[PDB]
Design a binder for this molecule. Structure first.
Ligand SMILES: NC(=O)c1cc2c(-c3ccc(C(=O)NCc4cccc(N)c4)s3)cccc2s1
Ligand SMILES: NC(=O)c1cc2c(-c3ccc(C(=O)NCc4cccc(N)c4)s3)cccc2s1
Ligand SMILES: NC(=O)c1cc2c(-c3ccc(C(=O)NCc4cccc(N)c4)s3)cccc2s1
Ligand SMILES: NC(=O)c1cc2c(-c3ccc(C(=O)NCc4cccc(N)c4)s3)cccc2s1
Lengths: 317, 326, 326, 321
């Protein structure tokens, strides 16, 4: 991976981004900017490249007009036993935007409104194509030079609907994944909810040190997981006893058995954060609170649908 | 299971007005036939196993209740029973909450006053005494199966669904509640009233600290955690267990099994590392009277949590212990 | 078999006996040189068979009441610890050195206390009734002599748990305790409960305000007549439940007033003639605020001194009474 | 009935200090926080009405845990001598009393009516989310807080699941009765929209919109506003023969019954004139009254299917401008 080098007898590499992603000009297209993702030659990462290629192709093929905010794969090739995915050029990820523009205290509610709509449109396309992303978070969301259009990236995470709790990013992990319940598109809707709170506050919604702490924090917001849901979980015994008490595990392990968790998480107070806002922004923050309340239902089946999300006051009013 | 409705009348006299517990459903009712006096009603699940378990509970509560007519030995009072739509219904004295709820509401997840624990320990040892006098093993003593009055001053041992005659010796190592399970049950040794003494030991630590004493993921881990306190189980004890081969090798080394890929570490000894006094005291800076009682709780736990049931403090010795007497 | 106490003598290699308090068992004042010469009271129990058992019961009741109230909010004497000295049980108490009998002398000058002080003492005694009931204990001998006060006389503590029983013991005969404070259900031999302690407190509250015994009956029969001079004839349903009903009432449930050479007057009724208000006020003339409280004391005594225990104000209704609350 | 006395304590915590059978009480177990205790009459019918009220309020309260959709909060319940007692948030008075004391029998400020309208539509949105018909919405069953800024829908003794179809045409309050209930047509959330329509007019004018002496007269008064009920709607009515002939003429029954058979009813009810009244109003408020009238026009369509939706009502110029 060296600057000045040429890939596929056309891509002149002039920059790093941060597997490896480089910025290059296509000599065969009047030196138009591309991004090239070079995937490691090792056994696991190659088969993950094969999958990411197939998922992008299927999502690109299912959105020809590019209205549903997934990363555009231009083409692929091989350079010295290494798979290379050529992509539309893009500035940076929302993790970088939160640093530089958010200054670690989050973005303007207008920006979150716009980002919310685009991410909801991304879920719609993922559902249509029977795809779970499973690793949605600011780091896997790219933006253009002007920072107004986001594309969801990194589908090396991705799976078909029909297909474990340590696989992706703990903070954005849905409770049904943690307890080992059968899961659908709701896990991506959950991860989006976590992301929206983080885009406005700059902070992790559920900063749990373990899957156990994750369930505790989700229940600090919504109270104890419903018995009907706990029971459908293959890993219920790791978190709940035979009486369906929660086992709060602190790490040598100390365990506290709880009959109930009192809801204590004040989502509105954490979103506002003593800002003293004008009336128009205050209303949009209250509407984000309501949207989050509807997204972060512990039972997937009770979560706001993608269409109800796109129609939500926060995005529409 | 029976989904009972507010205002429904049971046995032509019990006006159901509330719910208490969702294993079995306990409802709050008023006795139309007895001045609207508060009762609790346990509706037993209708299957063959659960109704047989219910009739066993009925028998054991009657023996304990008849052996303690003046109600001094802290077992739940069964008033009477009836049948409603093929469900056995146990009518009980009106108790509101269990010590699990007390530990949440008044413990705030970090335990109760050492003096409250002292009084509760005395009350539980009196229940152990009644159980032994009637040749009964409870086999599932834990905060969830201990009820209290509204003031939380008096506790009643409840749920005789897991109970047996001392001689039934039919407790297999996967019955009941792992965290309160005595080492003799886990290795498949012959066992007695000692298993109830062990479970009370585990309960007392939890009442003071708010935390499980032995939070083992498995029976194997439960043995490890007990031996982290007392050192390796005695050879004479291992040899008497029909399940020794699941936990120990032919040399009587312990097999520490970490789980679905098993890792095994074979151990000649377990170094006593578990420090009960440091765990009980915790961060707290206590007045001298409380600090003394904690030290005495620790000595009592040391005498309760002997891995060999034959070496374990008796009920009478427990009641005569400095924690209880002084 | 009393114990010959000596000033300067040392008990349990730590208690410097410096003064006497009461002896009729022996209470002494001492300093604890093992704990900064801090003041304690030591009750030394008579070494005979009756008082040995009585001292052990007292010991058990104090531990239970003390345990049920760890922050000392419900006004019972604090037992610090106990020990044996020449085979005499010794109870070590927080250093109170005055009872309400002495306060009625020194500060009441035999004509009773300020109504505002009675109101405070009433709330404090109702809190002691609450703790006794929560622990299912009957004191059975509540009166000024068995109520201790701190040096400033702001705080009272119920003491002497030697007459005390479990609610179920049903063993209190009609000659056992202090005749003036003895409830009618005890006298007629009816089944009794916490009601008896509520009755004694009512008798005490009157005496705290007037300095005078409410019912100075020479006998159990005189006690019932004086009670009925306030409330009228005991209800029939109550007379019939009395094992000793034939000692006080004829087959027609007329009252037999025994004047003692025994003289007997058979009465179909008793006219309420006791004027509680007039006796509380008692030709005094008080500022308005005090006058209002005395009327409220009167209304509370009316609700406490119901002859049927099942009609008497509860402890919770007493604490919510206008006398306590307003 | 149970004659409850001042100073009495219910469930060993509720000190009854006042009348409103609904009573005012302080909860001795919750720092003397105020509550209202409804003591349900002790017979067969009222016990089941009370139990239905308990059930409908649990569901409604649980569906709206942040209390945004303006139904009465049921805190808990208990039995006192076999009377079901419902413990509610401690609300001041009903809109009937507000119309007397603050309205002076001639209605409320159009600003108040606008606020109240939005609050009632939010109550309709929740009732519909929970598949519940109130079936008795009127000023007497709407409560207000001490400042009269917040209304709550109360009295769910009349209520039913949308599917029940058990509401006969002599149930509930005649003046607020929807035409579909009167002709015995299958009905839905539309009957509560109708009752709100009727309430809004009464809240602004102080007067009953349709003060009909009988069900027949209620239909006549409604058709005085909108003309004869559509033929397709009449035919679907189980009781159509009590009010219309085989020719679908309306039979106007006047009471010694006399009957006038009418081919049509000419719309004569001037809703704008009635709302305006004697008043000369600032352009400010004249516009809000014109918008209320338009809103009332869209609510009071005789055909339930042609009525404004709850979302259309909330997004209506009357509320949003
Ligand atoms: N993952 C993927 O599949 C893809 C990522 C990209 C990108 C990236 C933009 C920012 C990236 C990043 O790692 N920033 C974090 C960061 C952190 C600290 C410093 C700097 N310079 C950057 S990666 C651009 C175009 C196509 C793709 S496909
Ligand atoms: N098992 C038995 O045999 C019996 C239990 C009872 C009880 C109970 C008191 C609290 C209970 C409980 O499940 N609390 C835990 C809990 C957990 C979570 C929520 C809530 N509300 C309560 S069950 C009361 C009266 C008689 C019996 S007999
Ligand atoms: N009864 C008991 O169990 C206890 C009594 C006490 C006391 C007493 C305070 C004054 C007493 C007394 O007899 N005063 C009356 C009196 C009468 C005549 C003269 C003098 N000096 C005093 S006894 C103090 C501390 C602990 C206990 S335990
Ligand atoms: N029905 C129900 O379910 C409920 C009614 C209420 C109320 C009431 C407020 C005023 C009422 C009333 O009858 N007003 C008429 C009026 C007018 C003039 C004088 C007096 N005393 C009364 S009833 C308050 C709190 C909870 C509930 S639940």
């Amino acid at each position: 991976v060296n600057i000045g080098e040429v890939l596929d007898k056309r891509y002149n590499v002039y920059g790093y981004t941060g597997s490896n992603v480089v910025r290059a000009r296509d000599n065969a297209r009047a030196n138009q900017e591309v991004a090239v993702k070079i995937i490691r030659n090792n056994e696991l990462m190659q088969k993950t490249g094969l999958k990411e290629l197939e998922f992008l192709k299927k999502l690109n093929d299912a959105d020809p007009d590019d209205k549903f905010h997934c990363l555009r794969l231009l083409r692929h090739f091989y350079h010295k036993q290494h798979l290379c995915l050529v992509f539309e050029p893009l500035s940076m990820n929302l993790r970088e935007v939160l640093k530089k523009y958010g200054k670690d205290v989050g973005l303007h509610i207008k920006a979150v409104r716009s980002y919310s709509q685009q991410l909801f449109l991304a879920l719609k396309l993922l559902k249509r194509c029977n795809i779970l992303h499973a690793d949605i978070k600011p780091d896997n969301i790219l933006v253009n030079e002007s920072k107004t259009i986001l594309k969801l990236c990194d589908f090396g995470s991705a799976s078909h609907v029909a297909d474990t709790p340590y696989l992706f990013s703990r903070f954005y992990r849905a409770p049904e994944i943690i307890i080992g319940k059968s899961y659908d598109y709701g896990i991506d809707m959950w991860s989006v909810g976590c992301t929206l709170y983080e885009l406005y506050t700059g902070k992790i919604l559920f900063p749990g040190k373990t899957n156990n702490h994750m369930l505790k924090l989700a229940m600090d917001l919504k109270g104890k997981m419903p018995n009907k849901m706990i029971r459908k979980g293959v890993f219920k015994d790791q978190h709940f006893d035979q009486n369906l008490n929660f086992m709060y595990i602190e790490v040598r392990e100390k365990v506290t058995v709880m009959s109930t968790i009192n809801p204590t998480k004040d989502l509105l107070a954490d979103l506002i954060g003593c800002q003293r806002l004008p009336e128009d922004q205050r209303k949009k923050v209250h509407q984000l609170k309501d949207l989050l309340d509807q997204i972060l239902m512990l039972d997937p089946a009770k979560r706001i649908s993608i269409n109800q999300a796109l129609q939500h006051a926060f995005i529409q009013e």
